[PDB]
């Protein structure tokens, strides 16, 4: 929904990550 990649969305491998990026203990981005 609106609050989950810049909320720091707690990622499993069930979670609907909302960006795709970097499912260790959240969603955030790591990429060149």
Same mark, same amino acid.
């Given at each position: 929904?609106?609050?989950?990649?810049? #909320? =720091?969305?707690?990622?499993?491998?069930?979670?609907?990550?909302?960006?795709? =990026?970097?499912?260790?203990? #959240?969603?955030?981005?790591?990429?060149?």
């Amino acid at each position: 929904g609106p609050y989950c990649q810049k #909320w =720091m969305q707690t990622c499993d491998s069930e979670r609907k990550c909302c960006e795709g =990026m970097v499912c260790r203990l #959240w969603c955030k981005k790591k990429l060149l």
